[PDB]
Amino acid sequence: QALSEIETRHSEIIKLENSIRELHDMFMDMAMLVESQGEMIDRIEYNVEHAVDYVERAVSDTKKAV
Amino acid sequence: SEIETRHSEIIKLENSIRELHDMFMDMAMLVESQGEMIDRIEYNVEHAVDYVERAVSDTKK
Amino acid sequence: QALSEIETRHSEIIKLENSIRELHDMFMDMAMLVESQGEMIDRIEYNVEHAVDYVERAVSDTKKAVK
Amino acid sequence: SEIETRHSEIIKLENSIRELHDMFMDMAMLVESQGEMIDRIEYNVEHAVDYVERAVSDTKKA
């Protein structure tokens, strides 16, 4: 009924495993948030990139009318 | 005793895991905080884009 | 030769692109280190799991000796 | 005037960019602490695995 020494060891290691495994949900939550933030930044860079192209075209066009 | 040693090892390792779990919480909060700063930056940038595009259009181009 | 106004607006928006790219690069480095941390945790989980299966087997064999 | 508002916006943009940069410095620090805590956990887990498997074998042989 009570645990033997070998069973006690086993229980301890199983407890450690579940605990390492359960770190998953929290890590995935953080990871998702970090990944989402990266894309936000990337969209901002994308729009600025578009602004630079728009202006570069206008600058190149205007010079033509010179 | 050897038993005490093994027990302190299990408790420390346990606190460490819980602690890591908390750093992840702190990270999440830090990311949400940066998310407001990014919204502020995007607002500034969108206006900056507007400014240069208007100024470059009115100057016929 | 001094920059015209249009050229100045161009320079300004270009700087802005380089600035945002830098912010983006700093963030992506950290993001890669975080991804890497998750993989390490997976490996650890994988090793403890394999250890658990090992102990299980031994607990079974130690009990089967009882006969 | 236009200078006042214009200059004001050039400063707001630069300030918000530097502030995020600063926040990124704090993030980097937490990323480092996370990694180190994980290094430590890898060590403790390697030890616990070795310990229990050793004990498990001595019991099967005794």
PDB file of all heavy atoms in Angstrom, chain B residues 25-56:
ATOM      1  N   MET B  25       5.462  35.022 -17.570  1.00  0.00           N
ATOM      2  CA  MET B  25       4.312  35.889 -17.318  1.00  0.00           C
ATOM      3  C   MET B  25       4.794  37.324 -17.476  1.00  0.00           C
ATOM      4  O   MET B  25       4.183  38.124 -18.182  1.00  0.00           O
ATOM      5  CB  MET B  25       3.774  35.686 -15.903  1.00  0.00           C
ATOM      6  CG  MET B  25       3.020  34.392 -15.691  1.00  0.00           C
ATOM      7  SD  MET B  25       1.298  34.490 -16.213  1.00  0.00           S
ATOM      8  CE  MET B  25       0.517  35.056 -14.668  1.00  0.00           C
ATOM      9  N   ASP B  26       5.901  37.631 -16.810  1.00  0.00           N
ATOM     10  CA  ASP B  26       6.510  38.952 -16.877  1.00  0.00           C
ATOM     11  C   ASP B  26       6.824  39.353 -18.319  1.00  0.00           C
ATOM     12  O   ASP B  26       6.699  40.520 -18.688  1.00  0.00           O
ATOM     13  CB  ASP B  26       7.812  38.964 -16.081  1.00  0.00           C
ATOM     14  CG  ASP B  26       7.591  38.770 -14.604  1.00  0.00           C
ATOM     15  OD1 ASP B  26       6.473  39.053 -14.119  1.00  0.00           O
ATOM     16  OD2 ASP B  26       8.550  38.344 -13.928  1.00  0.00           O
ATOM     17  N   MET B  27       7.262  38.387 -19.122  1.00  0.00           N
ATOM     18  CA  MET B  27       7.593  38.659 -20.510  1.00  0.00           C
ATOM     19  C   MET B  27       6.324  39.050 -21.240  1.00  0.00           C
ATOM     20  O   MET B  27       6.304  40.026 -21.977  1.00  0.00           O
ATOM     21  CB  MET B  27       8.219  37.422 -21.177  1.00  0.00           C
ATOM     22  CG  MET B  27       8.589  37.615 -22.652  1.00  0.00           C
ATOM     23  SD  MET B  27       9.850  38.915 -22.940  1.00  0.00           S
ATOM     24  CE  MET B  27      11.351  38.065 -22.377  1.00  0.00           C
ATOM     25  N   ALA B  28       5.260  38.282 -21.024  1.00  0.00           N
ATOM     26  CA  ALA B  28       3.980  38.553 -21.666  1.00  0.00           C
ATOM     27  C   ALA B  28       3.545  39.990 -21.372  1.00  0.00           C
ATOM     28  O   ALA B  28       3.146  40.729 -22.279  1.00  0.00           O
ATOM     29  CB  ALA B  28       2.934  37.576 -21.172  1.00  0.00           C
ATOM     30  N   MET B  29       3.640  40.380 -20.104  1.00  0.00           N
ATOM     31  CA  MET B  29       3.262  41.721 -19.700  1.00  0.00           C
ATOM     32  C   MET B  29       4.148  42.768 -20.354  1.00  0.00           C
ATOM     33  O   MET B  29       3.669  43.825 -20.774  1.00  0.00           O
ATOM     34  CB  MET B  29       3.337  41.857 -18.179  1.00  0.00           C
ATOM     35  CG  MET B  29       2.132  41.280 -17.450  1.00  0.00           C
ATOM     36  SD  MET B  29       2.278  41.462 -15.651  1.00  0.00           S
ATOM     37  CE  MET B  29       2.552  43.260 -15.510  1.00  0.00           C
ATOM     38  N   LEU B  30       5.442  42.471 -20.438  1.00  0.00           N
ATOM     39  CA  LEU B  30       6.406  43.380 -21.041  1.00  0.00           C
ATOM     40  C   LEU B  30       6.072  43.593 -22.520  1.00  0.00           C
ATOM     41  O   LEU B  30       6.185  44.709 -23.040  1.00  0.00           O
ATOM     42  CB  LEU B  30       7.813  42.810 -20.885  1.00  0.00           C
ATOM     43  CG  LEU B  30       8.984  43.580 -21.498  1.00  0.00           C
ATOM     44  CD1 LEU B  30       8.994  45.012 -20.986  1.00  0.00           C
ATOM     45  CD2 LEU B  30      10.287  42.877 -21.141  1.00  0.00           C
ATOM     46  N   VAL B  31       5.652  42.516 -23.182  1.00  0.00           N
ATOM     47  CA  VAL B  31       5.291  42.559 -24.594  1.00  0.00           C
ATOM     48  C   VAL B  31       4.010  43.355 -24.836  1.00  0.00           C
ATOM     49  O   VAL B  31       3.883  44.047 -25.846  1.00  0.00           O
ATOM     50  CB  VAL B  31       5.108  41.127 -25.167  1.00  0.00           C
ATOM     51  CG1 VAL B  31       4.522  41.193 -26.573  1.00  0.00           C
ATOM     52  CG2 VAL B  31       6.449  40.405 -25.190  1.00  0.00           C
ATOM     53  N   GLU B  32       3.059  43.260 -23.916  1.00  0.00           N
ATOM     54  CA  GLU B  32       1.811  43.996 -24.066  1.00  0.00           C
ATOM     55  C   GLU B  32       2.088  45.484 -23.845  1.00  0.00           C
ATOM     56  O   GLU B  32       1.491  46.353 -24.486  1.00  0.00           O
ATOM     57  CB  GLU B  32       0.772  43.465 -23.071  1.00  0.00           C
ATOM     58  CG  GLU B  32       0.525  41.958 -23.246  1.00  0.00           C
ATOM     59  CD  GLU B  32      -0.597  41.410 -22.368  1.00  0.00           C
ATOM     60  OE1 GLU B  32      -0.596  41.679 -21.145  1.00  0.00           O
ATOM     61  OE2 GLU B  32      -1.474  40.694 -22.907  1.00  0.00           O
ATOM     62  N   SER B  33       3.019  45.765 -22.942  1.00  0.00           N
ATOM     63  CA  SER B  33       3.404  47.132 -22.646  1.00  0.00           C
ATOM     64  C   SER B  33       4.095  47.727 -23.879  1.00  0.00           C
ATOM     65  O   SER B  33       3.830  48.867 -24.263  1.00  0.00           O
ATOM     66  CB  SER B  33       4.344  47.147 -21.438  1.00  0.00           C
ATOM     67  OG  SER B  33       4.843  48.445 -21.170  1.00  0.00           O
ATOM     68  N   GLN B  34       4.971  46.950 -24.511  1.00  0.00           N
ATOM     69  CA  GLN B  34       5.660  47.444 -25.693  1.00  0.00           C
ATOM     70  C   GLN B  34       4.640  47.629 -26.816  1.00  0.00           C
ATOM     71  O   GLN B  34       4.815  48.470 -27.691  1.00  0.00           O
ATOM     72  CB  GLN B  34       6.776  46.478 -26.105  1.00  0.00           C
ATOM     73  CG  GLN B  34       7.881  46.354 -25.042  1.00  0.00           C
ATOM     74  CD  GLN B  34       8.932  45.281 -25.354  1.00  0.00           C
ATOM     75  OE1 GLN B  34       8.645  44.264 -25.997  1.00  0.00           O
ATOM     76  NE2 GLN B  34      10.149  45.498 -24.875  1.00  0.00           N
ATOM     77  N   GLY B  35       3.563  46.850 -26.761  1.00  0.00           N
ATOM     78  CA  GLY B  35       2.513  46.933 -27.759  1.00  0.00           C
ATOM     79  C   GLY B  35       1.804  48.275 -27.779  1.00  0.00           C
ATOM     80  O   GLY B  35       1.296  48.695 -28.816  1.00  0.00           O
ATOM     81  N   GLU B  36       1.746  48.948 -26.636  1.00  0.00           N
ATOM     82  CA  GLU B  36       1.111  50.254 -26.583  1.00  0.00           C
ATOM     83  C   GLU B  36       2.109  51.262 -27.152  1.00  0.00           C
ATOM     84  O   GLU B  36       1.734  52.179 -27.878  1.00  0.00           O
ATOM     85  CB  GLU B  36       0.744  50.634 -25.142  1.00  0.00           C
ATOM     86  CG  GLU B  36      -0.165  49.630 -24.439  1.00  0.00           C
ATOM     87  CD  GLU B  36      -0.700  50.134 -23.102  1.00  0.00           C
ATOM     88  OE1 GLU B  36       0.072  50.729 -22.309  1.00  0.00           O
ATOM     89  OE2 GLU B  36      -1.903  49.920 -22.842  1.00  0.00           O
ATOM     90  N   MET B  37       3.384  51.083 -26.818  1.00  0.00           N
ATOM     91  CA  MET B  37       4.436  51.967 -27.304  1.00  0.00           C
ATOM     92  C   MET B  37       4.503  51.859 -28.829  1.00  0.00           C
ATOM     93  O   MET B  37       4.729  52.846 -29.525  1.00  0.00           O
ATOM     94  CB  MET B  37       5.779  51.563 -26.694  1.00  0.00           C
ATOM     95  CG  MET B  37       6.945  52.447 -27.104  1.00  0.00           C
ATOM     96  SD  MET B  37       6.786  54.087 -26.394  1.00  0.00           S
ATOM     97  CE  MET B  37       6.094  54.992 -27.727  1.00  0.00           C
ATOM     98  N   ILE B  38       4.297  50.652 -29.346  1.00  0.00           N
ATOM     99  CA  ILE B  38       4.331  50.453 -30.778  1.00  0.00           C
ATOM    100  C   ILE B  38       3.123  51.134 -31.434  1.00  0.00           C
ATOM    101  O   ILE B  38       3.253  51.705 -32.517  1.00  0.00           O
ATOM    102  CB  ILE B  38       4.390  48.950 -31.123  1.00  0.00           C
ATOM    103  CG1 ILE B  38       5.757  48.395 -30.711  1.00  0.00           C
ATOM    104  CG2 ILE B  38       4.190  48.736 -32.615  1.00  0.00           C
ATOM    105  CD1 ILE B  38       5.940  46.898 -30.987  1.00  0.00           C
ATOM    106  N   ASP B  39       1.963  51.094 -30.775  1.00  0.00           N
ATOM    107  CA  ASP B  39       0.770  51.746 -31.313  1.00  0.00           C
ATOM    108  C   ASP B  39       1.049  53.245 -31.386  1.00  0.00           C
ATOM    109  O   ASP B  39       0.630  53.916 -32.332  1.00  0.00           O
ATOM    110  CB  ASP B  39      -0.462  51.532 -30.416  1.00  0.00           C
ATOM    111  CG  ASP B  39      -1.031  50.129 -30.506  1.00  0.00           C
ATOM    112  OD1 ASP B  39      -0.803  49.439 -31.523  1.00  0.00           O
ATOM    113  OD2 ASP B  39      -1.732  49.724 -29.554  1.00  0.00           O
ATOM    114  N   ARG B  40       1.732  53.765 -30.365  1.00  0.00           N
ATOM    115  CA  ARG B  40       2.085  55.178 -30.321  1.00  0.00           C
ATOM    116  C   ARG B  40       3.025  55.489 -31.470  1.00  0.00           C
ATOM    117  O   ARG B  40       2.853  56.488 -32.153  1.00  0.00           O
ATOM    118  CB  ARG B  40       2.756  55.538 -28.990  1.00  0.00           C
ATOM    119  CG  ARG B  40       3.417  56.930 -28.950  1.00  0.00           C
ATOM    120  CD  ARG B  40       2.405  58.069 -29.117  1.00  0.00           C
ATOM    121  NE  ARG B  40       1.354  58.038 -28.101  1.00  0.00           N
ATOM    122  CZ  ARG B  40       0.340  58.902 -28.035  1.00  0.00           C
ATOM    123  NH1 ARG B  40       0.225  59.885 -28.925  1.00  0.00           N
ATOM    124  NH2 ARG B  40      -0.577  58.772 -27.083  1.00  0.00           N
ATOM    125  N   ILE B  41       4.015  54.625 -31.688  1.00  0.00           N
ATOM    126  CA  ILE B  41       4.967  54.821 -32.779  1.00  0.00           C
ATOM    127  C   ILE B  41       4.277  54.755 -34.136  1.00  0.00           C
ATOM    128  O   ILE B  41       4.514  55.600 -34.997  1.00  0.00           O
ATOM    129  CB  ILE B  41       6.124  53.788 -32.707  1.00  0.00           C
ATOM    130  CG1 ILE B  41       7.058  54.173 -31.554  1.00  0.00           C
ATOM    131  CG2 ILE B  41       6.886  53.722 -34.037  1.00  0.00           C
ATOM    132  CD1 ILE B  41       8.246  53.259 -31.386  1.00  0.00           C
ATOM    133  N   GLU B  42       3.411  53.767 -34.332  1.00  0.00           N
ATOM    134  CA  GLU B  42       2.696  53.667 -35.597  1.00  0.00           C
ATOM    135  C   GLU B  42       1.872  54.930 -35.906  1.00  0.00           C
ATOM    136  O   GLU B  42       1.739  55.331 -37.068  1.00  0.00           O
ATOM    137  CB  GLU B  42       1.767  52.462 -35.608  1.00  0.00           C
ATOM    138  CG  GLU B  42       0.821  52.511 -36.798  1.00  0.00           C
ATOM    139  CD  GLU B  42       0.425  51.160 -37.285  1.00  0.00           C
ATOM    140  OE1 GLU B  42      -0.110  50.372 -36.481  1.00  0.00           O
ATOM    141  OE2 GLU B  42       0.653  50.886 -38.477  1.00  0.00           O
ATOM    142  N   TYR B  43       1.315  55.542 -34.864  1.00  0.00           N
ATOM    143  CA  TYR B  43       0.525  56.758 -35.018  1.00  0.00           C
ATOM    144  C   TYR B  43       1.438  57.899 -35.473  1.00  0.00           C
ATOM    145  O   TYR B  43       1.072  58.688 -36.340  1.00  0.00           O
ATOM    146  CB  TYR B  43      -0.154  57.098 -33.690  1.00  0.00           C
ATOM    147  CG  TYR B  43      -0.924  58.397 -33.659  1.00  0.00           C
ATOM    148  CD1 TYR B  43      -1.852  58.718 -34.655  1.00  0.00           C
ATOM    149  CD2 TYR B  43      -0.794  59.266 -32.575  1.00  0.00           C
ATOM    150  CE1 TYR B  43      -2.637  59.868 -34.561  1.00  0.00           C
ATOM    151  CE2 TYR B  43      -1.570  60.406 -32.470  1.00  0.00           C
ATOM    152  CZ  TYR B  43      -2.490  60.703 -33.463  1.00  0.00           C
ATOM    153  OH  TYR B  43      -3.265  61.833 -33.335  1.00  0.00           O
ATOM    154  N   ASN B  44       2.628  57.973 -34.887  1.00  0.00           N
ATOM    155  CA  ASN B  44       3.612  58.990 -35.251  1.00  0.00           C
ATOM    156  C   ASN B  44       4.114  58.776 -36.674  1.00  0.00           C
ATOM    157  O   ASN B  44       4.249  59.729 -37.441  1.00  0.00           O
ATOM    158  CB  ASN B  44       4.814  58.941 -34.309  1.00  0.00           C
ATOM    159  CG  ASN B  44       4.503  59.499 -32.945  1.00  0.00           C
ATOM    160  OD1 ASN B  44       3.451  60.102 -32.736  1.00  0.00           O
ATOM    161  ND2 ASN B  44       5.422  59.316 -32.009  1.00  0.00           N
ATOM    162  N   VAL B  45       4.395  57.520 -37.008  1.00  0.00           N
ATOM    163  CA  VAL B  45       4.896  57.142 -38.322  1.00  0.00           C
ATOM    164  C   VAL B  45       3.868  57.362 -39.414  1.00  0.00           C
ATOM    165  O   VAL B  45       4.205  57.831 -40.500  1.00  0.00           O
ATOM    166  CB  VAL B  45       5.321  55.656 -38.345  1.00  0.00           C
ATOM    167  CG1 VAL B  45       5.573  55.191 -39.774  1.00  0.00           C
ATOM    168  CG2 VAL B  45       6.583  55.473 -37.508  1.00  0.00           C
ATOM    169  N   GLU B  46       2.617  57.001 -39.141  1.00  0.00           N
ATOM    170  CA  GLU B  46       1.566  57.178 -40.136  1.00  0.00           C
ATOM    171  C   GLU B  46       1.429  58.651 -40.499  1.00  0.00           C
ATOM    172  O   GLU B  46       1.220  58.997 -41.658  1.00  0.00           O
ATOM    173  CB  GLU B  46       0.242  56.624 -39.620  1.00  0.00           C
ATOM    174  CG  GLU B  46       0.188  55.105 -39.621  1.00  0.00           C
ATOM    175  CD  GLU B  46       0.537  54.524 -40.977  1.00  0.00           C
ATOM    176  OE1 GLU B  46      -0.181  54.812 -41.953  1.00  0.00           O
ATOM    177  OE2 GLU B  46       1.537  53.788 -41.073  1.00  0.00           O
ATOM    178  N   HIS B  47       1.570  59.516 -39.502  1.00  0.00           N
ATOM    179  CA  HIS B  47       1.494  60.949 -39.726  1.00  0.00           C
ATOM    180  C   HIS B  47       2.725  61.427 -40.496  1.00  0.00           C
ATOM    181  O   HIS B  47       2.633  62.319 -41.338  1.00  0.00           O
ATOM    182  CB  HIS B  47       1.415  61.692 -38.399  1.00  0.00           C
ATOM    183  CG  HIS B  47       1.481  63.177 -38.545  1.00  0.00           C
ATOM    184  ND1 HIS B  47       0.533  63.896 -39.238  1.00  0.00           N
ATOM    185  CD2 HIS B  47       2.408  64.073 -38.133  1.00  0.00           C
ATOM    186  CE1 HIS B  47       0.872  65.172 -39.251  1.00  0.00           C
ATOM    187  NE2 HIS B  47       2.006  65.306 -38.587  1.00  0.00           N
ATOM    188  N   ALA B  48       3.879  60.839 -40.195  1.00  0.00           N
ATOM    189  CA  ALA B  48       5.120  61.204 -40.877  1.00  0.00           C
ATOM    190  C   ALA B  48       5.025  60.807 -42.348  1.00  0.00           C
ATOM    191  O   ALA B  48       5.506  61.515 -43.219  1.00  0.00           O
ATOM    192  CB  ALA B  48       6.312  60.511 -40.220  1.00  0.00           C
ATOM    193  N   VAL B  49       4.417  59.659 -42.613  1.00  0.00           N
ATOM    194  CA  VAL B  49       4.233  59.193 -43.979  1.00  0.00           C
ATOM    195  C   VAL B  49       3.277  60.153 -44.693  1.00  0.00           C
ATOM    196  O   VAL B  49       3.494  60.517 -45.842  1.00  0.00           O
ATOM    197  CB  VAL B  49       3.622  57.783 -44.003  1.00  0.00           C
ATOM    198  CG1 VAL B  49       3.099  57.460 -45.391  1.00  0.00           C
ATOM    199  CG2 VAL B  49       4.672  56.756 -43.573  1.00  0.00           C
ATOM    200  N   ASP B  50       2.215  60.559 -44.001  1.00  0.00           N
ATOM    201  CA  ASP B  50       1.232  61.474 -44.569  1.00  0.00           C
ATOM    202  C   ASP B  50       1.921  62.790 -44.947  1.00  0.00           C
ATOM    203  O   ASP B  50       1.782  63.284 -46.062  1.00  0.00           O
ATOM    204  CB  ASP B  50       0.118  61.751 -43.546  1.00  0.00           C
ATOM    205  CG  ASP B  50      -1.111  62.403 -44.172  1.00  0.00           C
ATOM    206  OD1 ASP B  50      -1.023  62.848 -45.334  1.00  0.00           O
ATOM    207  OD2 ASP B  50      -2.163  62.474 -43.498  1.00  0.00           O
ATOM    208  N   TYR B  51       2.671  63.340 -44.002  1.00  0.00           N
ATOM    209  CA  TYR B  51       3.377  64.587 -44.223  1.00  0.00           C
ATOM    210  C   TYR B  51       4.261  64.596 -45.466  1.00  0.00           C
ATOM    211  O   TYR B  51       4.111  65.472 -46.318  1.00  0.00           O
ATOM    212  CB  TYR B  51       4.221  64.947 -43.000  1.00  0.00           C
ATOM    213  CG  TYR B  51       5.166  66.090 -43.274  1.00  0.00           C
ATOM    214  CD1 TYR B  51       4.681  67.353 -43.607  1.00  0.00           C
ATOM    215  CD2 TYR B  51       6.546  65.893 -43.270  1.00  0.00           C
ATOM    216  CE1 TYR B  51       5.553  68.394 -43.939  1.00  0.00           C
ATOM    217  CE2 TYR B  51       7.426  66.924 -43.600  1.00  0.00           C
ATOM    218  CZ  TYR B  51       6.923  68.168 -43.934  1.00  0.00           C
ATOM    219  OH  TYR B  51       7.787  69.187 -44.266  1.00  0.00           O
ATOM    220  N   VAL B  52       5.181  63.639 -45.579  1.00  0.00           N
ATOM    221  CA  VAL B  52       6.069  63.612 -46.738  1.00  0.00           C
ATOM    222  C   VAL B  52       5.360  63.296 -48.045  1.00  0.00           C
ATOM    223  O   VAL B  52       5.788  63.767 -49.095  1.00  0.00           O
ATOM    224  CB  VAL B  52       7.255  62.603 -46.573  1.00  0.00           C
ATOM    225  CG1 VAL B  52       8.034  62.925 -45.315  1.00  0.00           C
ATOM    226  CG2 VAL B  52       6.749  61.167 -46.562  1.00  0.00           C
ATOM    227  N   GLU B  53       4.298  62.494 -48.000  1.00  0.00           N
ATOM    228  CA  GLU B  53       3.581  62.178 -49.231  1.00  0.00           C
ATOM    229  C   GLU B  53       2.780  63.395 -49.716  1.00  0.00           C
ATOM    230  O   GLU B  53       2.760  63.681 -50.915  1.00  0.00           O
ATOM    231  CB  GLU B  53       2.692  60.947 -49.043  1.00  0.00           C
ATOM    232  CG  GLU B  53       3.496  59.666 -48.765  1.00  0.00           C
ATOM    233  CD  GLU B  53       2.675  58.391 -48.893  1.00  0.00           C
ATOM    234  OE1 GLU B  53       1.422  58.482 -48.894  1.00  0.00           O
ATOM    235  OE2 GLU B  53       3.282  57.294 -48.983  1.00  0.00           O
ATOM    236  N   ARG B  54       2.149  64.127 -48.797  1.00  0.00           N
ATOM    237  CA  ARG B  54       1.417  65.330 -49.189  1.00  0.00           C
ATOM    238  C   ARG B  54       2.379  66.362 -49.773  1.00  0.00           C
ATOM    239  O   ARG B  54       2.129  66.925 -50.840  1.00  0.00           O
ATOM    240  CB  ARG B  54       0.712  65.985 -47.995  1.00  0.00           C
ATOM    241  CG  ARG B  54      -0.483  65.229 -47.457  1.00  0.00           C
ATOM    242  CD  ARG B  54      -1.327  66.116 -46.553  1.00  0.00           C
ATOM    243  NE  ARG B  54      -2.377  65.343 -45.903  1.00  0.00           N
ATOM    244  CZ  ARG B  54      -3.390  65.866 -45.226  1.00  0.00           C
ATOM    245  NH1 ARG B  54      -3.511  67.185 -45.102  1.00  0.00           N
ATOM    246  NH2 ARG B  54      -4.281  65.062 -44.674  1.00  0.00           N
ATOM    247  N   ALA B  55       3.478  66.611 -49.062  1.00  0.00           N
ATOM    248  CA  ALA B  55       4.477  67.599 -49.478  1.00  0.00           C
ATOM    249  C   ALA B  55       5.122  67.269 -50.810  1.00  0.00           C
ATOM    250  O   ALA B  55       5.570  68.157 -51.531  1.00  0.00           O
ATOM    251  CB  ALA B  55       5.555  67.734 -48.411  1.00  0.00           C
ATOM    252  N   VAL B  56       5.169  65.990 -51.140  1.00  0.00           N
ATOM    253  CA  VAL B  56       5.788  65.561 -52.379  1.00  0.00           C
ATOM    254  C   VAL B  56       4.798  65.463 -53.526  1.00  0.00           C
ATOM    255  O   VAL B  56       5.189  65.340 -54.684  1.00  0.00           O
ATOM    256  CB  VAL B  56       6.529  64.221 -52.145  1.00  0.00           C
ATOM    257  CG1 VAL B  56       6.239  63.224 -53.246  1.00  0.00           C
ATOM    258  CG2 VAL B  56       8.015  64.497 -52.027  1.00  0.00           C
TER     259      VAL B  56
END
